[PDB]
Design a protein around this ligand. Structure first.
Ligand SMILES: [Mg+2]
Length: 247
C-alpha cells in the first residue's frame, strides 16, 4: 500500500547493486525498529536477492528475514505502480490568458495520481527554464508547487527545448532504469526559428533515456509540430485528463 522507500532505492530491485542492498537493510532496520542487522548478511546485488527463497531469509536473518522477504515483495508491487511524471508548462506570451487551462490541467491531473510512488515535477519555460518543483513524492511539496504554478506570469517566447532538457536531466539522474519517467508537455506548438529543430532533437533524447513524450495542445496547436515532439500522433491530445490517466 504505502512504503516509505527513500532515494537511491526508488528503482526496481532488479537494478540494485550490493551497496543498495546494504542501504535497504539499514533503512528497514530503523523504519521497522528491527534488531541490529549485520551488513554482511546479504552480500549480493539486487538480482541475487530476488532469487533467494523465504527460508533463505530466515537462515541469514533469524530475527527478521521473513519481514525482509515480505517487504521485498511489497516493494516489487510498489515499483510496478511507480511512475515519474514531468509537467512541461509553456509560460510564454503565446499562451497569454490561456494559462488558467494549463494550471487546471495539471491540478486536476495531480489529484488523480495519489499513489506514494507517483512523483511529480513542475518545469515551466518561457525564454527561460526554471524547475518550480523538483521530482518528489511529498504531497506537501507538490501542493507548494501547485501554488507556485499560479504565481507564474506568462512572459517570454516559446523554447520547449530548454524545458525538455531539465526534464531529461532529472531522468538522467534517475537513470534508464526509471523507464516509468513520463514527460507531459503543455504547449501550443507556436515555435519560431530553429526551436522546431531543437524541440524534436531534445524529444529524441527523452526517448533515448526511455521516456514517453506526451503533448497537450492549448488553444491553437500545430498538430504536425506536436506529433514530431511526441512519439506518435496518439500521444497528442487537447476526457483528455482521463486519456492522460489511462496512458
Ligand atoms: Mg510563445
Amino acid at each position: 500500500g504505502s512504503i516509505a522507500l527513500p532515494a537511491h532505492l526508488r528503482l526496481q530491485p532488479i537494478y540494485w547493486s550490493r551497496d543498495d542492498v546494504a542501504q535497504w537493510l539499514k533503512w528497514a532496520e530503523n523504519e521497522f525498529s528491527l534488531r541490529p542487522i549485520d551488513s554482511n548478511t546479504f552480500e549480493m546485488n539486487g538480482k541475487a536477492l530476488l532469487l533467494l527463497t523465504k527460508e533463505d531469509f530466515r537462515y541469514r536473518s533469524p530475527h527478521s528475514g521473513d519481514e525482509l522477504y515480505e517487504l521485498l515483495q511489497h516493494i516489487l508491487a510498489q515499483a510496478r505502480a511507480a511512475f515519474d511524471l514531468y509537467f512541461v508548462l509553456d509560460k510564454s506570451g503565446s499562451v497569454a490568458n490561456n494559462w488558467i487551462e494549463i494550471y487546471n490541467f495539471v491540478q486536476q491531473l495531480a489529484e488523480r495520481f495519489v499513489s506514494p510512488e507517483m512523483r511529480l515535477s513542475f518545469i515551466v519555460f518561457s525564454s527561460q527554464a526554471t524547475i518550480i518543483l523538483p521530482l518528489t513524492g511529498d504531497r506537501g511539496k507538490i501542493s507548494k508547487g501547485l501554488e507556485d504554478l499560479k504565481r507564474v506570469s506568462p512572459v517570454g517566447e516559446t523554447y520547449i527545448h530548454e524545458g525538455l532538457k531539465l526534464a531529461n536531466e532529472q531522468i538522467q539522474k534517475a537513470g534508464g532504469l526509471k523507464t516509468s519517467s513520463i514527460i507531459i508537455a503543455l504547449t501550443d506548438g507556436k515555435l519560431d526559428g530553429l526551436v522546431p529543430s531543437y524541440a524534436e532533437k531534445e524529444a529524441k533524447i527523452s526517448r533515448s533515456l526511455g521516456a514517453s513524450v506526451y503533448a497537450v495542445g492549448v488553444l491553437d496547436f500545430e498538430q504536425a509540430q506536436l506529433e514530431r515532439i511526441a512519439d506518435s500522433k496518439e500521444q497528442v491530445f487537447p476526457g483528455f485528463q482521463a486519456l492522460k490517466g489511462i496512458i
